[PDB]
DNA sequence: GACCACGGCGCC
DNA sequence: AAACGGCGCCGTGGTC
Protein backbone atom coordinates (compact mmCIF):
# COMPACT_ATOMS: atom_id res chain seq x y z
CA UNK A 1 0.00 0.00 0.00
CA UNK A 2 0.98 3.61 -0.61
CA UNK A 3 2.17 5.20 2.63
CA UNK A 4 0.19 8.45 2.94
CA UNK A 5 0.25 11.21 5.58
CA UNK A 6 -2.12 11.18 8.54
CA UNK A 7 -5.28 12.04 8.43
CA UNK A 8 -7.16 9.25 6.63
CA UNK A 9 -10.30 10.06 4.64
CA UNK A 10 -13.89 9.27 5.68
CA UNK A 11 -14.75 5.56 6.07
CA UNK A 12 -11.14 4.27 6.43
CA UNK A 13 -10.42 1.03 8.32
CA UNK A 14 -8.54 1.50 11.59
CA UNK A 15 -5.81 -0.62 13.15
CA UNK A 16 -4.32 -0.16 16.61
CA UNK A 17 -2.05 -1.73 19.22
CA UNK A 18 -2.77 -1.69 22.98
CA UNK A 19 -0.23 -2.26 25.78
CA UNK A 20 -2.66 -4.82 27.16
CA UNK A 21 -6.03 -6.36 26.31
CA UNK A 22 -8.26 -4.31 28.66
CA UNK A 23 -9.15 -1.07 26.82
CA UNK A 24 -9.89 0.86 30.07
CA UNK A 25 -6.36 0.13 31.35
CA UNK A 26 -4.40 0.08 28.06
CA UNK A 27 -1.88 2.52 26.64
CA UNK A 28 -2.63 3.17 22.95
CA UNK A 29 0.80 2.34 21.48
CA UNK A 30 0.03 2.99 17.80
CA UNK A 31 -2.83 3.85 15.48
CA UNK A 32 -3.15 3.59 11.70
CA UNK A 33 -5.76 3.52 8.93
CA UNK A 34 -6.25 1.99 5.48
CA UNK A 35 -8.44 2.95 2.52
CA UNK A 36 -8.29 3.21 -1.29
CA UNK A 37 -4.80 1.68 -1.67
CA UNK A 38 -3.17 3.83 1.04
CA UNK A 39 -2.01 3.30 4.59
CA UNK A 40 -1.90 6.25 6.99
CA UNK A 41 0.17 5.95 10.17
CA UNK A 42 -0.53 8.35 13.04
CA UNK A 43 2.62 10.10 14.36
CA UNK A 44 1.14 10.35 17.89
CA UNK A 45 -1.83 7.94 18.37
CA UNK A 46 -3.68 9.81 21.18
CA UNK A 47 -3.89 13.13 19.26
CA UNK A 48 -4.71 11.25 16.06
CA UNK A 49 -7.81 9.69 17.72
CA UNK A 50 -9.50 13.11 17.37
CA UNK A 51 -9.43 12.95 13.55
CA UNK A 52 -11.63 9.82 13.28
CA UNK A 53 -15.44 9.97 13.27
CA UNK A 54 -15.92 6.18 13.76
CA UNK A 55 -13.88 3.13 14.76
CA UNK A 56 -14.16 0.79 11.80
CA UNK A 57 -12.12 -2.45 11.80
CA UNK A 58 -11.00 -5.44 13.85
CA UNK A 59 -11.89 -5.09 17.55
CA UNK A 60 -13.57 -1.72 16.87
CA UNK A 61 -15.42 -1.73 20.23
CA UNK A 62 -12.10 -1.92 22.13
CA UNK A 63 -10.78 1.25 20.45
CA UNK A 64 -14.17 2.94 21.01
CA UNK A 65 -13.95 2.20 24.75
CA UNK A 66 -10.45 3.69 24.97
CA UNK A 67 -11.68 6.74 23.03
CA UNK A 68 -14.63 7.16 25.44
CA UNK A 69 -12.15 6.89 28.34
CA UNK A 70 -10.33 9.88 26.77
CA UNK A 71 -13.58 11.89 26.42
CA UNK A 72 -14.09 11.27 22.70
CA UNK A 73 -17.34 10.11 21.07
CA UNK A 74 -15.91 7.64 18.57
CA UNK A 75 -18.58 5.00 17.97
CA UNK A 76 -17.63 1.52 16.73
CA UNK A 77 -18.80 0.68 13.19
CA UNK A 78 -18.06 -2.28 10.94
CA UNK A 79 -15.95 -5.05 12.53
CA UNK A 80 -14.92 -8.12 10.47
CA UNK A 81 -14.89 -10.13 13.77
CA UNK A 82 -18.67 -9.73 14.00
CA UNK A 83 -19.11 -10.84 10.39
CA UNK A 84 -16.90 -13.85 11.03
CA UNK A 85 -18.67 -14.66 14.30
CA UNK A 86 -22.07 -14.64 12.57
CA UNK A 87 -20.65 -16.91 9.82
CA UNK A 88 -19.38 -19.37 12.45
CA UNK A 89 -19.19 -18.57 16.17
CA UNK A 90 -16.03 -20.65 16.59
CA UNK A 91 -14.56 -17.50 14.98
CA UNK A 92 -13.70 -15.90 18.32
CA UNK A 93 -10.14 -14.47 17.91
CA UNK A 94 -8.50 -12.13 15.40
CA UNK A 95 -5.61 -14.67 15.09
CA UNK A 96 -7.99 -17.32 13.79
CA UNK A 97 -10.23 -15.06 11.74
CA UNK A 98 -7.16 -13.62 9.94
CA UNK A 99 -5.76 -17.08 9.14
CA UNK A 100 -9.15 -18.32 7.91
CA UNK A 101 -10.21 -15.34 5.74
CA UNK A 102 -7.05 -13.94 4.14
CA UNK A 103 -4.25 -12.52 6.30
CA UNK A 104 -2.08 -12.56 9.40
CA UNK A 105 -2.81 -10.80 12.69
CA UNK A 106 0.45 -9.07 13.65
CA UNK A 107 1.45 -6.45 16.25
CA UNK A 108 1.71 -3.44 13.88
CA UNK A 109 -1.15 -0.92 13.59
CA UNK A 110 -0.57 -0.40 9.86
CA UNK A 111 -0.82 -4.11 9.07
CA UNK A 112 -3.83 -4.46 11.36
CA UNK A 113 -5.51 -1.56 9.47
CA UNK A 114 -4.76 -3.10 6.03
CA UNK A 115 -5.86 -6.51 7.36
CA UNK A 116 -9.15 -5.06 8.63
CA UNK A 117 -9.79 -3.64 5.12
CA UNK A 118 -9.10 -6.85 3.22
CA UNK A 119 -10.80 -9.12 5.80
CA UNK A 120 -13.93 -6.92 5.62
CA UNK A 121 -14.07 -7.19 1.81
CA UNK A 122 -13.72 -10.98 1.93
CA UNK A 123 -16.15 -11.60 4.81
CA UNK A 124 -18.66 -9.19 3.26
CA UNK A 125 -18.39 -11.41 0.14
CA UNK A 126 -19.13 -14.56 2.19
CA UNK A 127 -22.28 -13.02 3.64
CA UNK A 128 -23.79 -12.04 0.25
CA UNK A 129 -27.16 -13.82 0.01
CA UNK A 130 -27.12 -14.67 3.74
CA UNK A 131 -29.98 -12.28 4.43
CA UNK A 132 -30.80 -13.49 7.95
CA UNK A 133 -27.16 -13.25 9.08
CA UNK A 134 -27.02 -9.79 7.44
CA UNK A 135 -30.12 -8.77 9.41
CA UNK A 136 -28.42 -9.93 12.61
CA UNK A 137 -25.31 -7.94 11.70
CA UNK A 138 -27.16 -4.70 10.84
CA UNK A 139 -29.93 -4.78 13.45
CA UNK A 140 -28.24 -6.53 16.43
CA UNK A 141 -24.47 -7.05 16.47
CA UNK A 142 -23.17 -3.86 14.84
CA UNK A 143 -25.41 -1.47 16.88
CA UNK A 144 -24.89 -3.63 20.01
CA UNK A 145 -21.13 -2.98 19.79
CA UNK A 146 -21.74 0.76 20.33
CA UNK A 147 -23.99 0.05 23.35
CA UNK A 148 -21.38 -2.25 24.93
CA UNK A 149 -18.65 0.37 24.40
CA UNK A 150 -20.67 2.82 26.51
CA UNK A 151 -21.43 0.24 29.20
CA UNK A 152 -17.77 -0.70 29.43
CA UNK A 153 -16.63 2.92 29.75
CA UNK A 154 -19.24 3.81 32.38
CA UNK A 155 -18.40 1.04 34.86
CA UNK A 156 -20.12 0.40 38.20
CA UNK A 157 -19.61 1.87 41.68
CA UNK A 158 -18.20 -0.43 44.36
CA UNK A 159 -18.15 -0.03 48.13
CA UNK A 160 -14.38 -0.60 48.47
CA UNK A 161 -14.07 0.05 52.22
CA UNK A 162 -16.95 -2.37 52.91
CA UNK A 163 -15.17 -5.17 51.05
CA UNK A 164 -11.86 -4.44 52.77
CA UNK A 165 -13.64 -4.67 56.12
CA UNK A 166 -15.33 -7.91 55.00
CA UNK A 167 -11.99 -9.42 53.99
CA UNK A 168 -10.58 -9.11 57.55
CA UNK A 169 -13.66 -10.80 59.08
CA UNK A 170 -13.66 -13.58 56.47
CA UNK A 171 -9.90 -14.21 57.05
CA UNK A 172 -10.54 -14.88 60.76
CA UNK A 173 -13.34 -17.38 59.98
CA UNK A 174 -11.16 -19.13 57.38
CA UNK A 175 -8.48 -19.52 60.08
CA UNK A 176 -11.08 -21.08 62.44
CA UNK A 177 -12.16 -23.57 59.75
CA UNK A 178 -8.68 -24.58 58.61
CA UNK A 179 -7.55 -25.03 62.22
CA UNK A 180 -10.43 -27.49 62.84
CA UNK A 181 -9.73 -29.35 59.57
CA UNK A 182 -6.05 -29.75 60.53
CA UNK A 183 -7.03 -31.09 63.96
CA UNK A 184 -9.45 -33.63 62.39
CA UNK A 185 -6.79 -34.65 59.85
CA UNK A 186 -4.33 -35.02 62.75
CA UNK A 187 -1.83 -32.79 60.91
CA UNK A 188 -1.63 -29.65 58.72
CA UNK A 189 -1.46 -29.64 54.91
CA UNK A 190 -2.38 -27.35 52.01
CA UNK A 191 -6.15 -27.37 52.19
CA UNK A 192 -6.27 -25.47 48.86
CA UNK A 193 -4.52 -28.40 47.15
CA UNK A 194 -7.17 -30.87 46.07
CA UNK A 195 -4.36 -33.45 45.51
CA UNK A 196 -3.26 -33.14 49.14
CA UNK A 197 -6.90 -33.20 50.26
CA UNK A 198 -7.55 -36.37 48.19
CA UNK A 199 -4.86 -38.26 50.12
CA UNK A 200 -6.14 -37.05 53.47
CA UNK A 201 -9.81 -37.88 52.76
CA UNK A 202 -9.56 -41.24 50.97
CA UNK A 203 -6.20 -42.72 52.09
CA UNK A 204 -5.43 -41.39 55.59
CA UNK A 205 -9.08 -41.31 56.56
CA UNK A 206 -11.24 -44.18 55.29
CA UNK A 207 -13.87 -42.26 53.37
CA UNK A 208 -15.33 -43.74 50.17
CA UNK A 209 -14.23 -42.15 46.88
CA UNK A 210 -17.56 -41.61 45.07
CA UNK A 211 -16.14 -40.46 41.69
CA UNK A 212 -13.25 -39.70 39.36
CA UNK A 213 -11.97 -36.57 37.62
CA UNK A 214 -12.29 -36.24 33.86
CA UNK A 215 -8.81 -35.70 32.37
CA UNK A 216 -6.53 -37.38 34.94
CA UNK A 217 -8.79 -39.89 36.76
CA UNK A 218 -8.01 -38.69 40.30
CA UNK A 219 -10.54 -39.32 43.11
CA UNK A 220 -12.76 -36.22 43.07
CA UNK A 221 -13.11 -33.83 46.01
CA UNK A 222 -15.90 -31.78 44.40
CA UNK A 223 -18.85 -30.45 46.42
CA UNK A 224 -21.12 -33.01 44.75
CA UNK A 225 -18.92 -35.86 46.07
CA UNK A 226 -18.41 -34.28 49.50
CA UNK A 227 -22.15 -33.55 49.83
CA UNK A 228 -22.62 -37.35 49.82
CA UNK A 229 -20.22 -37.65 52.82
CA UNK A 230 -21.64 -34.66 54.76
CA UNK A 231 -21.77 -36.54 58.10
CA UNK A 232 -19.60 -39.50 57.04
CA UNK A 233 -17.32 -37.16 58.98
CA UNK A 234 -17.34 -33.71 60.66
CA UNK A 235 -14.21 -32.77 58.62
CA UNK A 236 -16.23 -32.70 55.36
CA UNK A 237 -18.62 -30.09 56.79
CA UNK A 238 -15.63 -27.91 57.66
CA UNK A 239 -14.05 -28.46 54.22
CA UNK A 240 -17.22 -27.35 52.39
CA UNK A 241 -17.49 -24.20 54.54
CA UNK A 242 -13.77 -23.52 53.96
CA UNK A 243 -14.32 -23.92 50.18
CA UNK A 244 -17.17 -21.41 50.12
CA UNK A 245 -15.30 -18.80 52.13
CA UNK A 246 -11.99 -19.13 50.22
CA UNK A 247 -13.72 -19.12 46.80
CA UNK A 248 -15.55 -15.90 47.62
CA UNK A 249 -12.57 -14.18 49.26
CA UNK A 250 -10.01 -15.01 46.55
CA UNK A 251 -12.35 -14.46 43.54
CA UNK A 252 -14.38 -11.41 44.66
CA UNK A 253 -13.65 -9.87 48.08
CA UNK A 254 -9.88 -9.35 47.56
CA UNK A 255 -9.44 -8.72 43.77
CA UNK A 256 -12.34 -6.34 43.07
CA UNK A 257 -11.34 -3.43 45.33
CA UNK A 258 -7.93 -3.28 43.55
CA UNK A 259 -9.56 -2.85 40.10
CA UNK A 260 -11.04 0.61 40.72
CA UNK A 261 -10.01 2.86 37.86
CA UNK A 262 -8.24 6.14 38.98
CA UNK A 263 -10.02 8.48 36.50
CA UNK A 264 -13.58 7.13 36.92
CA UNK A 265 -13.57 5.82 40.52
CA UNK A 266 -15.49 2.85 39.15
CA UNK A 267 -15.11 -0.83 38.31
CA UNK A 268 -14.97 -1.66 34.55
CA UNK A 269 -15.69 -5.00 32.89
CA UNK A 270 -15.33 -6.03 29.26
CA UNK A 271 -18.38 -7.39 27.40
CA UNK A 272 -17.03 -9.91 24.90
CA UNK A 273 -19.17 -10.05 21.81
CA UNK A 274 -17.58 -12.96 19.89
CA UNK A 275 -16.90 -15.38 22.73
CA UNK A 276 -19.67 -17.98 22.96
CA UNK A 277 -20.93 -20.78 20.74
CA UNK A 278 -24.60 -19.80 21.33
CA UNK A 279 -24.52 -15.99 20.81
CA UNK A 280 -24.48 -15.03 24.49
CA UNK A 281 -22.13 -12.30 25.59
CA UNK A 282 -19.38 -12.98 28.10
CA UNK A 283 -17.79 -10.71 30.70
CA UNK A 284 -14.13 -10.66 31.75
CA UNK A 285 -11.35 -8.66 33.39
CA UNK A 286 -13.23 -8.80 35.87
CA UNK A 287 -16.21 -11.11 35.13
CA UNK A 288 -19.26 -9.22 36.44
CA UNK A 289 -21.75 -11.87 35.22
CA UNK A 290 -20.88 -14.22 38.10
CA UNK A 291 -20.96 -11.95 41.15
CA UNK A 292 -22.33 -14.01 44.08
CA UNK A 293 -26.02 -13.94 44.93
CA UNK A 294 -26.99 -17.29 46.47
CA UNK A 295 -25.42 -17.79 49.94
CA UNK A 296 -25.53 -15.30 52.86
CA UNK A 297 -21.84 -14.36 52.29
CA UNK A 298 -22.51 -14.09 48.56
CA UNK A 299 -25.41 -11.72 49.29
CA UNK A 300 -23.08 -9.61 51.47
CA UNK A 301 -20.65 -9.34 48.51
CA UNK A 302 -23.38 -8.32 46.06
CA UNK A 303 -24.35 -5.42 48.38
CA UNK A 304 -20.96 -3.83 47.51
CA UNK A 305 -22.36 -2.98 44.02
CA UNK A 306 -24.04 0.36 44.66
CA UNK A 307 -25.50 3.41 42.91
CA UNK A 308 -23.78 6.76 42.49
CA UNK A 309 -24.95 9.27 45.13
CA UNK A 310 -28.17 10.84 43.78
CA UNK A 311 -28.83 7.75 41.59
CA UNK A 312 -30.53 4.34 41.98
CA UNK A 313 -29.81 0.94 40.42
CA UNK A 314 -32.63 -0.55 38.38
CA UNK A 315 -32.39 -4.31 37.86
CA UNK A 316 -34.59 -6.10 35.28
CA UNK A 317 -34.67 -9.89 34.82
CA UNK A 318 -36.75 -11.88 32.31
CA UNK A 319 -39.06 -14.46 33.86
CA UNK A 320 -38.41 -18.16 33.05
CA UNK A 321 -36.88 -17.02 29.82
CA UNK A 322 -35.66 -20.22 28.09
CA UNK A 323 -38.94 -22.02 28.88
CA UNK A 324 -40.90 -19.21 27.19
CA UNK A 325 -38.54 -19.39 24.21
CA UNK A 326 -39.07 -23.19 24.07
CA UNK A 327 -42.83 -22.63 23.94
CA UNK A 328 -42.32 -20.34 20.93
CA UNK A 329 -39.78 -22.56 19.12
CA UNK A 330 -41.60 -25.89 19.64
CA UNK A 331 -45.07 -24.41 19.28
CA UNK A 332 -46.27 -26.73 22.07
CA UNK A 333 -49.91 -25.89 22.85
CA UNK A 334 -49.71 -26.94 26.51
CA UNK A 335 -46.51 -25.07 27.33
CA UNK A 336 -47.86 -21.97 25.54
CA UNK A 337 -50.96 -22.26 27.75
CA UNK A 338 -48.87 -22.41 30.95
CA UNK A 339 -47.43 -18.92 30.30
CA UNK A 340 -50.76 -17.51 29.07
CA UNK A 341 -52.11 -18.56 32.52
CA UNK A 342 -49.30 -16.76 34.44
CA UNK A 343 -47.97 -19.98 36.00
CA UNK A 344 -44.41 -20.36 37.29
CA UNK A 345 -42.73 -23.73 36.59
CA UNK A 346 -39.66 -22.99 38.77
CA UNK A 347 -41.92 -22.27 41.77
CA UNK A 348 -44.08 -25.30 40.94
CA UNK A 349 -41.05 -27.61 40.93
CA UNK A 350 -39.67 -26.05 44.15
CA UNK A 351 -43.02 -26.50 45.86
CA UNK A 352 -43.12 -30.13 44.68
CA UNK A 353 -39.42 -30.92 45.55
CA UNK A 354 -39.40 -29.50 49.06
CA UNK A 355 -43.02 -30.40 49.90
CA UNK A 356 -44.12 -26.89 50.91
CA UNK A 357 -46.77 -24.50 49.52
CA UNK A 358 -45.79 -21.90 46.93
CA UNK A 359 -45.77 -19.09 49.53
CA UNK A 360 -42.96 -20.87 51.47
CA UNK A 361 -40.60 -21.24 48.47
CA UNK A 362 -37.41 -19.25 49.23
CA UNK A 363 -34.66 -18.07 46.81
CA UNK A 364 -32.43 -21.09 47.64
CA UNK A 365 -35.27 -23.48 46.81
CA UNK A 366 -36.02 -21.68 43.55
CA UNK A 367 -32.40 -22.05 42.37
CA UNK A 368 -32.53 -25.80 43.18
CA UNK A 369 -35.74 -26.03 41.13
CA UNK A 370 -34.07 -24.31 38.17
CA UNK A 371 -31.39 -27.01 38.09
CA UNK A 372 -34.08 -29.70 37.93
CA UNK A 373 -36.15 -28.06 35.19
CA UNK A 374 -33.27 -27.11 32.88
CA UNK A 375 -31.42 -30.32 33.74
CA UNK A 376 -34.41 -32.41 32.74
CA UNK A 377 -35.03 -30.35 29.60
CA UNK A 378 -31.49 -30.44 28.30
CA UNK A 379 -31.12 -34.22 28.77
CA UNK A 380 -30.12 -34.99 32.37
CA UNK A 381 -30.15 -38.74 33.06
CA UNK A 382 -32.68 -40.42 35.35
CA UNK A 383 -29.71 -41.74 37.35
CA UNK A 384 -28.47 -38.21 38.04
CA UNK A 385 -31.99 -36.82 38.54
CA UNK A 386 -32.73 -39.48 41.22
CA UNK A 387 -29.55 -38.34 43.02
CA UNK A 388 -30.28 -34.59 42.77
CA UNK A 389 -33.90 -35.01 43.95
CA UNK A 390 -32.77 -37.66 46.53
CA UNK A 391 -35.54 -40.12 45.62
CA UNK A 392 -35.69 -43.54 43.89
CA UNK A 393 -34.89 -44.39 40.26
CA UNK A 394 -38.35 -44.28 38.65
CA UNK A 395 -40.03 -41.45 40.41
CA UNK A 396 -37.00 -39.89 38.64
CA UNK A 397 -37.72 -41.55 35.28
CA UNK A 398 -41.47 -40.99 35.89
CA UNK A 399 -40.65 -37.30 36.55
CA UNK A 400 -38.97 -37.17 33.11
CA UNK A 401 -42.07 -38.73 31.44
CA UNK A 402 -44.50 -36.55 33.46
CA UNK A 403 -42.49 -33.58 32.20
CA UNK A 404 -42.19 -34.62 28.53
CA UNK A 405 -45.75 -35.97 28.07
CA UNK A 406 -47.15 -32.74 29.56
CA UNK A 407 -45.42 -31.01 26.61
CA UNK A 408 -45.43 -33.52 23.69
CA UNK A 409 -44.23 -31.20 20.87
CA UNK A 410 -40.93 -30.41 22.69
CA UNK A 411 -39.51 -33.89 21.87
CA UNK A 412 -40.66 -33.49 18.25
CA UNK A 413 -38.89 -30.12 18.12
CA UNK A 414 -35.76 -31.72 19.64
CA UNK A 415 -35.78 -34.43 16.96
CA UNK A 416 -36.47 -31.92 14.15
CA UNK A 417 -33.63 -29.73 15.46
CA UNK A 418 -31.23 -32.72 15.43
CA UNK A 419 -32.12 -33.87 11.88
CA UNK A 420 -31.52 -30.35 10.48
CA UNK A 421 -28.19 -30.32 12.34
CA UNK A 422 -27.14 -33.70 10.95
CA UNK A 423 -28.11 -32.62 7.42
CA UNK A 424 -26.91 -29.00 7.21
CA UNK A 425 -24.09 -29.37 9.78
CA UNK A 426 -25.50 -26.51 11.90
CA UNK A 427 -28.48 -25.57 14.05
CA UNK A 428 -29.98 -22.11 14.37
CA UNK A 429 -31.85 -19.68 16.60
CA UNK A 430 -35.18 -18.07 15.75
CA UNK A 431 -33.29 -15.28 13.96
CA UNK A 432 -30.94 -17.59 12.02
CA UNK A 433 -27.88 -17.36 14.26
CA UNK A 434 -25.97 -20.59 13.50
CA UNK A 435 -23.82 -23.00 15.46
CA UNK A 436 -22.00 -25.71 13.54
CA UNK A 437 -22.21 -28.98 15.47
CA UNK A 438 -20.05 -31.44 13.55
CA UNK A 439 -20.22 -34.57 15.74
CA UNK A 440 -23.99 -35.33 15.44
CA UNK A 441 -23.17 -38.48 13.39
CA UNK A 442 -20.14 -39.51 15.50
CA UNK A 443 -19.90 -43.32 15.90
CA UNK A 444 -19.07 -43.06 19.65
CA UNK A 445 -22.26 -42.77 21.72
CA UNK A 446 -21.00 -40.51 24.51
CA UNK A 447 -19.51 -38.06 21.94
CA UNK A 448 -22.60 -38.17 19.70
CA UNK A 449 -25.00 -37.66 22.64
CA UNK A 450 -22.90 -34.81 24.08
CA UNK A 451 -23.04 -33.10 20.67
CA UNK A 452 -26.82 -33.67 20.57
CA UNK A 453 -27.36 -31.90 23.94
CA UNK A 454 -25.14 -29.01 22.75
CA UNK A 455 -27.02 -28.84 19.44
CA UNK A 456 -30.61 -28.69 20.79
CA UNK A 457 -29.68 -26.32 23.64
CA UNK A 458 -28.32 -23.63 21.31
CA UNK A 459 -31.49 -22.56 19.46
CA UNK A 460 -33.09 -21.96 22.87
CA UNK A 461 -30.22 -20.28 24.73
CA UNK A 462 -29.25 -18.43 21.56
CA UNK A 463 -32.76 -17.12 20.86
CA UNK A 464 -32.93 -15.81 24.45
CA UNK A 465 -29.55 -14.14 23.85
CA UNK A 466 -30.77 -12.62 20.56
CA UNK A 467 -33.86 -11.22 22.34
CA UNK A 468 -31.76 -9.60 25.09
CA UNK A 469 -29.31 -8.13 22.54
CA UNK A 470 -32.13 -6.65 20.47
CA UNK A 471 -33.72 -5.24 23.66
CA UNK A 472 -30.40 -3.63 24.57
CA UNK A 473 -30.15 -1.99 21.12
CA UNK A 474 -33.68 -0.55 21.40
CA UNK A 475 -33.41 0.50 25.04
CA UNK A 476 -30.04 2.34 24.94
CA UNK A 477 -31.22 5.43 23.00
CA UNK A 478 -34.29 5.78 25.21
CA UNK A 479 -32.10 5.70 28.34
CA UNK A 480 -29.71 8.44 27.23
CA UNK A 481 -32.75 10.68 26.41
CA UNK A 482 -33.76 10.28 30.07
CA UNK A 483 -30.22 10.75 31.45
CA UNK A 484 -30.00 7.08 32.52
CA UNK A 485 -27.13 4.59 32.04
CA UNK A 486 -26.92 0.91 31.09
CA UNK A 487 -24.33 -0.74 33.39
CA UNK A 488 -24.48 -4.50 33.12
CA UNK A 489 -25.93 -7.35 31.13
CA UNK A 490 -26.19 -10.72 32.93
CA UNK A 491 -27.61 -12.92 30.14
CA UNK A 492 -31.33 -12.31 30.76
CA UNK A 493 -30.86 -9.38 33.13
CA UNK A 494 -29.93 -5.72 32.79
CA UNK A 495 -28.65 -3.40 35.49
CA UNK A 496 -29.20 0.30 34.84
CA UNK A 497 -28.33 3.39 36.85
CA UNK A 498 -30.91 6.21 36.90
CA UNK A 499 -31.08 9.64 38.52
CA UNK A 500 -33.30 9.30 41.63
CA UNK A 501 -35.92 11.67 40.18
CA UNK A 502 -36.28 9.59 36.98
CA UNK A 503 -35.71 6.02 38.32
CA UNK A 504 -39.37 4.97 38.44
CA UNK A 505 -40.02 6.24 34.90
CA UNK A 506 -36.84 4.44 33.72
CA UNK A 507 -37.94 1.16 35.34
CA UNK A 508 -41.38 1.24 33.70
CA UNK A 509 -39.96 2.13 30.29
CA UNK A 510 -37.13 -0.44 30.42
CA UNK A 511 -39.62 -3.13 31.49
CA UNK A 512 -41.90 -2.42 28.50
CA UNK A 513 -39.02 -2.31 26.00
CA UNK A 514 -37.78 -5.69 27.31
CA UNK A 515 -41.25 -7.27 27.26
CA UNK A 516 -42.16 -6.10 23.73
CA UNK A 517 -38.76 -6.57 22.06
CA UNK A 518 -40.05 -9.25 19.60
CA UNK A 519 -43.47 -10.64 20.47
CA UNK A 520 -43.80 -14.42 20.65
CA UNK A 521 -46.64 -16.95 20.88
CA UNK A 522 -46.25 -16.39 24.66
CA UNK A 523 -45.79 -13.16 26.62
CA UNK A 524 -42.37 -12.23 28.04
CA UNK A 525 -42.54 -11.05 31.64
CA UNK A 526 -39.84 -8.98 33.28
CA UNK A 527 -39.39 -8.64 37.05
CA UNK A 528 -38.02 -5.19 37.90
CA UNK A 529 -36.74 -3.61 41.11
CA UNK A 530 -35.08 -0.37 42.22
CA UNK A 531 -32.49 0.07 44.98
CA UNK A 532 -29.31 1.57 46.37
CA UNK A 533 -27.51 -1.73 45.72
CA UNK A 534 -27.72 -4.66 43.30
CA UNK A 535 -29.20 -7.08 45.87
CA UNK A 536 -31.84 -4.62 47.14
CA UNK A 537 -32.75 -3.88 43.50
CA UNK A 538 -33.88 -7.53 42.90
CA UNK A 539 -35.91 -7.87 46.16
C1' DG B 1 7.67 -13.11 34.86
C1' DA B 2 4.84 -15.74 31.46
C1' DC B 3 2.16 -19.84 29.73
C1' DC B 4 -0.74 -23.90 30.35
C1' DA B 5 -3.93 -27.98 32.07
C1' DC B 6 -6.79 -29.26 35.55
C1' DG B 7 -10.25 -29.51 39.09
C1' DG B 8 -13.33 -26.90 41.05
C1' DC B 9 -17.07 -23.50 41.38
C1' DG B 10 -19.17 -18.69 41.01
C1' DC B 11 -23.19 -16.96 37.75
C1' DC B 12 -26.91 -17.39 33.91
C1' DA C 1 -19.71 -38.17 39.59
C1' DA C 2 -23.71 -38.73 37.22
C1' DA C 3 -26.31 -38.58 29.36
C1' DC C 4 -28.35 -30.77 31.52
C1' DG C 5 -26.10 -26.30 28.41
C1' DG C 6 -23.24 -21.65 28.25
C1' DC C 7 -19.23 -19.02 30.40
C1' DG C 8 -14.41 -16.93 33.23
C1' DC C 9 -11.23 -17.07 37.27
C1' DC C 10 -9.39 -19.12 41.26
C1' DG C 11 -5.09 -21.92 43.27
C1' DT C 12 -2.18 -25.74 42.33
C1' DG C 13 1.11 -28.01 39.91
C1' DG C 14 4.23 -28.10 36.09
C1' DT C 15 6.93 -25.90 32.48
C1' DC C 16 9.91 -22.44 30.10
N1 LIG D 1 -29.15 -25.30 30.91
C1 LIG D 1 -29.25 -24.47 31.98
N2 LIG D 1 -29.63 -23.21 31.73
C2 LIG D 1 -29.74 -22.34 32.76
C3 LIG D 1 -29.46 -22.77 34.14
N3 LIG D 1 -29.65 -21.69 34.91
C4 LIG D 1 -30.04 -20.70 34.11
N4 LIG D 1 -30.06 -21.09 32.83
C5 LIG D 1 -30.46 -20.30 31.64
C6 LIG D 1 -31.93 -20.62 31.45
C7 LIG D 1 -32.66 -19.47 32.08
O1 LIG D 1 -33.93 -19.29 31.46
C8 LIG D 1 -31.69 -18.32 31.77
C9 LIG D 1 -31.82 -17.14 32.71
O2 LIG D 1 -31.55 -17.56 34.03
P1 LIG D 1 -32.39 -17.07 35.30
O3 LIG D 1 -31.62 -17.47 36.53
O4 LIG D 1 -32.87 -15.68 35.10
O5 LIG D 1 -33.60 -18.14 35.29
P2 LIG D 1 -35.04 -17.84 34.60
O6 LIG D 1 -35.04 -16.64 33.73
O7 LIG D 1 -35.39 -19.19 34.03
O8 LIG D 1 -35.97 -17.69 35.91
P3 LIG D 1 -36.32 -16.34 36.69
O9 LIG D 1 -37.81 -16.21 36.41
O10 LIG D 1 -35.50 -15.17 36.17
O11 LIG D 1 -35.95 -16.77 38.09
O12 LIG D 1 -30.38 -18.91 31.85
C10 LIG D 1 -29.06 -24.15 34.32
O13 LIG D 1 -28.81 -24.61 35.47
N5 LIG D 1 -28.97 -24.93 33.22
MG1 LIG E 1 -34.69 -14.64 34.40
MG1 LIG F 1 -31.28 -13.76 35.42
Short structural summary:
It comes from Thermus aquaticus. This protein is of the alpha+beta class and 539 residues long.
Structure, described:
The protein has 539 residues and is of the alpha+beta class. It has four domains: 153 residues, Ribonuclease H-like superfamily/Ribonuclease H (Nucleotidyltransferase, domain 5, 2-Layer Sandwich); 117 residues, Up-down Bundle (Taq DNA Polymerase, Chain T, domain 4); 125 residues, Alpha-Beta Plaits (2-Layer Sandwich); 144 residues, no CATH class. The chain contains 20 helices and 14 strands. Strands 1-4-3-2 form a four-stranded mixed β-sheet. A four-stranded antiparallel β-sheet has the order 12-13-9-14. It has a two-stranded antiparallel sheet with strand order 5-8. Helix 2 packs parallel to helix 6, helix 12 crosses helix 13 and helix 14 crosses helix 15. The longest helix is centred in the C-terminal third of the chain and has 37 residues. The radius of gyration is 26 Å and the shape is globular. The protein starts with a strand and ends in an 8-residue tail after the last strand. The site of one magnesium ion has 5 residues, from strand 9. It binds a DNA duplex (12 and 16 nucleotides) through helix 8, helix 9, helix 10, strand 7 and helix 15. Keywords: DNA damage, DNA repair, DNA replication, DNA-binding, DNA-directed DNA polymerase, Exonuclease, Hydrolase, Nuclease, Nucleotidyltransferase, Transferase. Its EC number is 2.7.7.7.
Amino acid sequence: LEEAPWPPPEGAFVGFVLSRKEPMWADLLALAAARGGRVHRAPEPYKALRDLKEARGLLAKDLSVLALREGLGLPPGDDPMLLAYLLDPSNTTPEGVARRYGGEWTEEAGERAALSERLFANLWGRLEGEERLLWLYREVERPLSAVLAHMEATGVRLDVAYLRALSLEVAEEIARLEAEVFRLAGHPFNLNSRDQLERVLFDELGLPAIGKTEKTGKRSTSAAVLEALREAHPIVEKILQYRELTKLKSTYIDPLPDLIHPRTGRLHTRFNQTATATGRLSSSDPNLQNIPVRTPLGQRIRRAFIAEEGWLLVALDYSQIELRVLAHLSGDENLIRVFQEGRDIHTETASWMFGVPREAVDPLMRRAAKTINFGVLYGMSAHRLSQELAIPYEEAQAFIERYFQSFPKVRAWIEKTLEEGRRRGYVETLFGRRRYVPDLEARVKSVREAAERMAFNMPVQGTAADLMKLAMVKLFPRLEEMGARMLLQVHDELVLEAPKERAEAVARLAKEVMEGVYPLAVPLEVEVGIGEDWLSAKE
